[PDB]
């Protein structure tokens, strides 16, 4: 059978070798950072804060 | 004899500016990596305005 | 991150703006991260809400949290005997009105028969259109949910009614035809006064209590500016 075989054995390695890769770090972080805006300014006032 | 006239044209100009402020507390505690990603938080909301 | 909080934005503390000590513990899960309004007791201690002298200033209690979102109880500044700043003048921006417990508004569209509650999903049996108040309340502490008479507040002497809850976990709710039930929410409006109440609250509405603290502006600031009360 080995040549009806390595038809499929290549069909496999072919989407292995695209759909995978080997975890070297078994745990990955993911972050949400927040935002600011300038403001308009004035001769005597003062903005806010960030 | 002859007539002749022109005109001219001009450009608006605006101010803006923003805050930042920290108590005594949070300098004693904090990373210098948080007080440079909310500098650079303002350098985006710069870029944003302008 | 999901969140802002309030935090002042403004706060001189040579002006009318002070230190004190707290007379009782706040409680993280209810007043922490919020607008209080404050008084002083009978000792020289800051209480929320009105102490012996009435609302005489606007605390902010700034407390970390950690990623899962809970509170450390490990803090400086927020048992009784703590240290405290207090403002009367400044800004707070970030701003949004202090509500304590839950409230709930009940109107019933039925002129018959009887109407179905829920709280927390089981329901109330039955009330009949047409109740006084303490039939209302006792049919919601009726439920075997161990919620007591003591967990609510009921008023209302018309078809309209409002649930008032001391907790936080108790949600009222309509679940036949004939009645409805609607979460009396609260947000931050712009161009609008704010008052402290006795309770320690800060709210848009002015009662038969309520010093005014400030005005906002845009809708996420507070104009900090306490008209202290007076005997």
């Not at chain 1, 070297?24 to 006032?45: N, Y």
Request: net charge negative; proline share 3%; charged share 20%.
């Amino acid at each position: 059978f080995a040549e009806s075989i390595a038809i499929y054995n290549e069909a496999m390695d072919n989407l292995i070798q695209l759909l995978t890769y080997p975890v070297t770090v078994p745990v990955e972080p993911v972050v949400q950072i927040g935002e600011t805006t300038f403001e308009e300014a004035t001769e005597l006032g003062v903005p806010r804060g960030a | 004899g002859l007539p002749i006239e022109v005109f001219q044209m001009g450009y608006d100009l605006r101010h803006y500016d923003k805050r930042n402020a920290y108590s005594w507390m949070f300098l004693a505690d904090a990373d210098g990596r948080q007080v440079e990603a909310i500098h650079d938080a303002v350098l985006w909301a710069d870029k944003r305005l302008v | 991150a999901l969140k802002t909080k309030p935090r002042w934005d403004k706060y001189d503390g040579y002006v009318g703006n002070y230190r004190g000590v707290l007379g009782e513990d706040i409680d993280l899960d209810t007043e922490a991260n919020r607008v209080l309004a404050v008084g002083t007791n009978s000792n020289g201690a800051i209480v929320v809400g009105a102490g012996q002298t009435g609302i005489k200033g606007l605390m902010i209690v700034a407390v970390g949290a950690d990623i899962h979102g809970a509170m450390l109880d490990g803090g400086i500044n927020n048992h009784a005997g703590d240290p405290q700043d207090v403002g009367k003048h400044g800004e707070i921006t970030n701003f949004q009105p202090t509500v304590f417990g839950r409230t709930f508004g009940v109107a019933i569209s039925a002129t018959e028969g009887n109407v179905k509650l829920a709280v927390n999903g089981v329901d109330t049996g039955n009330i009949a259109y047409d109740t006084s108040a303490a039939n209302l309340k006792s049919g919601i502490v009726a439920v075997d949910d161990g919620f007591t008479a003591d967990d609510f507040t009921v008023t209302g002497t018309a078809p309209n009614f409002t649930i008032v809850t001391t907790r936080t976990d108790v949600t009222i709710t309509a679940s036949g035809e004939g009645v409805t039930v609607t979460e009396a929410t609260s947000v931050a409006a712009a161009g609008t006064n704010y008052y402290g109440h006795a309770d320690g609250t800060v709210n848009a509405v002015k009662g038969s209590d309520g010093v005014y603290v400030g005005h906002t502006q845009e809708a996420d600031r507070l104009i900090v500016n306490v008209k202290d009360e007076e005997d």
